[PDB]
RNA sequence: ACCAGGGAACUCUAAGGAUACUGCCAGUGACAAACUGGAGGAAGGCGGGGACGACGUCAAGUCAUCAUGGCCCUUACGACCAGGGCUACACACGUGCUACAAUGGUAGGUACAGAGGGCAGCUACACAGCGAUGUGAUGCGAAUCUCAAAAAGCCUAUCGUAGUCCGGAUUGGAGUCUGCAACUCGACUCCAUGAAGUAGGAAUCGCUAGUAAUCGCGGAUCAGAAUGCCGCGGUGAAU
């Protein structure tokens, strides 16, 4: 996955955007194109906006969910 | 190939060439074990924070001539078919058929 | 002093051929030590023993390259080798068991389009 | 004997029966007899009772059969209810590690 | 005790400049074959499909060397006149 | 292959017995070219069946038993004016080795002893003594043959 | 279907164009350098009739030999037009490149310059049954042993493309020392492509 | 490189020649071409392998290597960039890989190669680690140093016909690396889990000798990504 020497990979776009919401608390969602981002435990509660492909689809950010990039709660192929 | 596709690779390989010596001083600073653990993290940061196209893995190379992606071959720098010709012409040194 | 060089197929072994005690050493140890096959070990001796002669001359074996099967026969053909050239009258004998046949069998070329040698791929209906 | 709740034949070796209990591997058997002084070589109905405590004290160190099915259950049910793509992966009984499935997708379904 | 490595794609070329050199120096009268690369490469004869139609090409380089017994003042000179490109490389270590 | 007939290649016979026909059976049972386990498992088996029946001969023993194993007689199928029938035909002489060597190897694959040596120790004792399944393949070859008997 | 006989024939009979030795890294640019020479020295004299060129380079100046059927013109009034095309070649490339020019004895026996008459005579709108026999005749006279012309296309304007082949003399193309001379060339006609191969064998 | 006794004899490496030509003996043969056997030789009749694919046949495959006739589009069928996709399976399908085990599995020891690659670099050795790999350090542009240890094999211990000490799919957990990034979607590392599979329906395919089967080892594209492809040598059949 990642090699814990380098530690997490977390977008500076993102970066800044989640510490700008933070000082607010804000709860508008963080509309955002990178789903490589590592979900850290300072940007749990809030609301993102995970480009799928087609569209944002809202993610909101639980407890147990870091350890996990942002792109795994917004699936890609949509099969019936 | 494309002009287009080309020109995108020359212009590709002109950040790789001009960020090239920076690449392997900061690769060097990231390694250093004596190295600070947040000077290593800022240079890191940087690393990732360099131009998209600066790294030598968004490099493809193609024949010089026609631009083929594929059937490339590193000793010659060309496709397998400008190979083939040039080699059947003769305008390939040391190169002949093989049969053993 | 008589001194031979038989091949087989890969390898390369010198054979040196005196008289002597007998005792074959192989690669500068043993030759029972050196082969653990009983049918290199035969091979090794299949000479000697056709016109009897199993420890009259000492000989000196030094093979290397190829592999464990080979480098038998290899020892084979240089003690035959030195054999004749000491005498000339068991070239005849020693040619009717054509052990002074050098191997010319060797693993051949892989066919391009084939898996093996020869082995084609096969196509179901 | 009888051990972590679940009985293991006595007919062969002491760590190829600590393998078939279920959360235990050989690797894992051959680490726990080193420790203390039962060898890999001595069978079961050879081994004594007093040994067999002690090595059920050893595997009671180590995380219990029943315990191990509960927390996969539990990461598994982590995984549904959290509804991610590996969740969605889970419930509709598709591979959720990656591997290629186009054509020898046969081994998730069953 | 100068060294001379001479490398040339071609086998009939590399012994002729082999020859040369050791004759300027008996001439002069001071008193004077490592294994060669095989490499081999595939090429597509068709360009679309029929992949087991193909054509094979091996190059090899022949490497010589050399050692001087003896190098003399008028021996050593010689050797930087003497000249001869187009695909054969000369290397002294000079050593 | 309708083309001159060629010299087959000369066999080297096995070095404990001195006997081409020892290597010629140990050929058979060699598979995935394991000649080396092919020579333990005959050496154990004929090792074993020497032992029982205290001879001193193994390779003679050998002998006998391929030579009554081998059939004399084996059916061979003939077209003529479009119709098929079954024509019995004399054996050739190192086709009838073959034969017995390569049905022998047969049953003593199904024997059920463990290993390999005792299931070919096994099959050697009941060709011997005439029983078991190698013997009864030979019968059925001779029996097909003997049913008709019209032809030739 | 058939192989390119001076690559079969450069093993023994034959004598490669390019003669130069080079290090894998360095061979990479080499190659891709004598390549674009050859390529704009073609386009620049394809006006003058031109046999096929050797290219030597050592290391730093490159040194070029062209043998053509009319060395006047490319050397120009007093190696004017040579020094010019020189200057040129020089800038393409590296340190300064020397070539030499070396004349034919006959212009016929040489495949490269049968074949260019034959694209020109195409572009010209020249017959093709009339191009091939002249060309095949020409040789004959001169005493080349043999000469083969192959044309493939829509020859004369026609719909459907046809190959009409003509030979005279022995060519044996599997003798791989009949040293015989190919050389292909493609001539412009405005209805289509047409393909031009030439085959000269002079002997042993 | 090789040491037979510091030498150059032998091996090997690589540029040349020498031999093989039904030459010779005997036969059958239209007094012929040829063929049959025999001597010698390393090799006998084409000694084995490869390269070489005739006029043409399939309007056979390629406008997506490239080239060109015609035809079409030109704020778009042209140009750039982020994200995803080419990696989705109720099922069919052709190529292979790994098995179903005792001719074996696992543990210890112990041998025998070939050819190939290495600054867009392979690392001897020390220590951290169960491990992939990490930090130092050193030789080598290589017949020097190095990948590299060859595996099948041989000696002993054991498993004893059991879905097993067979088999390693699948999933959970932890991690190391390449890369700016490993979620869709990297290959490896350890721990646990241990699915089918106990030999296969009609039918069907390859193979004549160092060949089939079997064993591992290389290279190419490659920043990382093989069971594929291109080569290699060990063992070595029956007919």
């Known amino acids: 996955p990642r090699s814990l020497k380098k530690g997490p990979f977390i977008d500076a776009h993102l970066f800044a955007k989640v510490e700008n919401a933070l000082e607010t608390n804000s709860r508008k969602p963080i509309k955002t194109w990178s789903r490589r981002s590592m979900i850290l435990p300072q940007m749990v509660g809030l609301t993102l906006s995970v480009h799928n492909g087609r569209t944002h689809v809202p993610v909101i950010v639980s407890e147990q969910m870091v350890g996990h990039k942002l792109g795994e709660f917004a699936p890609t192929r949509t099969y019936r | 190939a494309k002009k287009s596709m080309i020109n995108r690779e020359l212009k590709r390989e002109k950040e790789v060439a001009k960020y090239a010596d920076k690449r392997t001083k900061l690769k060097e600073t990231i390694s250093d074990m004596n190295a600070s653990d947040e000077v290593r993290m800022d240079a890191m940061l940087e690393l990732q924070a360099l131009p998209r196209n600066s790294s030598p893995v968004r490099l493809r190379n193609r024949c010089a001539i026609t631009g083929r992606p594929h059937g490339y071959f590193r000793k010659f720098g060309l496709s397998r078919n400008m190979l083939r010709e040039r080699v059947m012409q003769g305008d390939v040194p040391g190169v002949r058929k093989a049969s053993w | 002093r008589n001194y031979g060089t038989g091949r087989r ?110 082995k084609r791929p096969q196509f179901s209906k | 004997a009888r051990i972590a709740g679940v009985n293991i034949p006595d007919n062969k070796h002491a760590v190829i029966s600590l393998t078939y209990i279920f959360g235990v591997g050989r690797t894992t058997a051959q680490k726990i007899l080193e420790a203390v002084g039962i060898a890999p070589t001595t069978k079961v109905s050879q081994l004594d009772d007093i040994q067999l405590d002690a090595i059920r004290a050893q595997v009671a160190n180590y995380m219990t059969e029943g315990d191990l099915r509960r927390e996969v259950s539990m990461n598994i049910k982590r995984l549904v209810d959290l509804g991610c793509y590996r969740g969605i992966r889970h419930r509709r009984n598709l591979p959720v590690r990656g591997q290629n499935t186009k054509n020898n997708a046969r081994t998730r379904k069953g | 005790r100068i060294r001379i490595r001479l490398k040339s794609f071609d086998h009939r070329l590399i012994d002729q400049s082999a020859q040369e050199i050791v004759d300027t120096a008996k001439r002069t009268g001071a008193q004077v074959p490592l294994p060669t690369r095989i490499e081999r490469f595939n090429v597509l004869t068709s360009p679309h499909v029929n992949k087991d139609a193909r054509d094979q090409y091996e190059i090899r380089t022949h490497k010589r060397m050399v050692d001087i017994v003896q190098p003399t003042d008028k021996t050593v000179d010689a050797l930087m006149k003497l000249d001869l490109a187009a695909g054969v490389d000369v290397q002294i270590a000079l050593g | 292959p309708r083309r001159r007939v060629v010299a087959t290649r000369e066999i080297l016979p096995d070095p404990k017995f001195g006997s081409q026909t020892i290597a010629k059976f140990i050929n058979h049972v060699m598979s995935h070219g394991k000649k080396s386990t092919a020579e333990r498992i005959v050496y154990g088996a004929l090792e074993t069946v020497a032992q029982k029946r205290n001879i001193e001969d193994p390779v003679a023993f050998f002998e006998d038993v391929l030579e009554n194993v081998r059939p004399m007689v084996e059916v061979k199928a003939r077209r003529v004016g479009g119709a098929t029938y079954q024509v019995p035909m004399e054996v050739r002489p190192s086709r009838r080795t073959a034969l017995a060597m390569r049905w022998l190897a047969e049953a003593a694959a199904k024997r059920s002893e463990k290993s390999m040596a005792l299931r070919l120790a096994g099959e050697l004792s009941d060709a011997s003594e005439g029983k078991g399944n190698a013997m009864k393949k030979r019968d059925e070859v001779h029996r097909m043959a003997d049913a008709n008997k019209a032809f030739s | 279907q058939k192989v390119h006989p001076i690559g079969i024939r450069l093993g023994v009979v034959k004598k490669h164009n390019a003669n130069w030795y080079a290090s894998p890294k360095q061979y990479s640019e080499y190659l891709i350098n004598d390549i674009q020479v ?92 009339r191009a091939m026999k002249r060309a095949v005749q020409n040789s004959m006279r001169s005493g080349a042993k043999g000469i083969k012309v192959e044309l493939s296309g829509r020859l004369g304007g026609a719909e459907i493309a046809r190959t009409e082949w003509y030979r005279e003399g022995r060519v044996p193309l599997h003798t791989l020392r009949a040293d015989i001379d190919y050389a292909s060339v493609r001539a412009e006609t405005t209805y289509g492509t047409i393909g031009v191969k030439v085959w000269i064998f002079r002997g042993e």
């Not at chain 3, 009897?52 to 035959?80: E, M, N």
């Not at chain 7, 020295?41 to 290219?55: E, F, H, T, Y």
């Not at chain 7, 007093?78 to 070649?89: A, S, V």
């Not at chain 7, 004349?103 to 709108?125: C, H, N, Y």
Request: aromatic share 4%; proline share 4%.
């Open chain 7, 38 to 129: 050859r390529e704009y020295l073609r386009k620049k004299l394809d006006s003058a009739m031109i046999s096929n060129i050797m290219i030597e380079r050592p290391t730093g100046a490159a040194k070029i030999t062209i043998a053509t059927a009319r060395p006047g013109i490319v050397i120009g009034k007093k190696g004017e037009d040579i020094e010019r095309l020189q200057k040129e070649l020089t800038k393409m490339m590296g340190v300064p490149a020397q070539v030499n020019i070396e004349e034919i004895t006959s212009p016929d026996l040489d495949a490269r310059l049968v074949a260019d008459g034959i694209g020109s005579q195409l572009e010209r709108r020249v017959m093709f049954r």
């Open chain 3, 9 to 118: 197929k890969t390898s390369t072994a010198r054979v040196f051929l005196a008289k002597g005690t007998g005792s074959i050493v192989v690669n500068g140890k043993p030759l029972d030590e050196y082969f653990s096959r009983e049918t290199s070990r035969m091979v090794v001796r299949q000479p000697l023993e056709l016109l009897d002669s199993p420890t009259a001359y000492d000989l000196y074996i030094t093979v290397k390259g190829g592999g464990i099967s080979g480098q038998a026969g290899a020892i084979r053909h240089g003690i035959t080798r030195a054999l004749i050239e000491l005498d000339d009258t068991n070239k005849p004998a020693l040619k009717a068991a054509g052990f002074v046949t050098r191997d010319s069998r060797q693993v051949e070329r892989k066919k391009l389009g084939l898996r093996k040698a020869r």
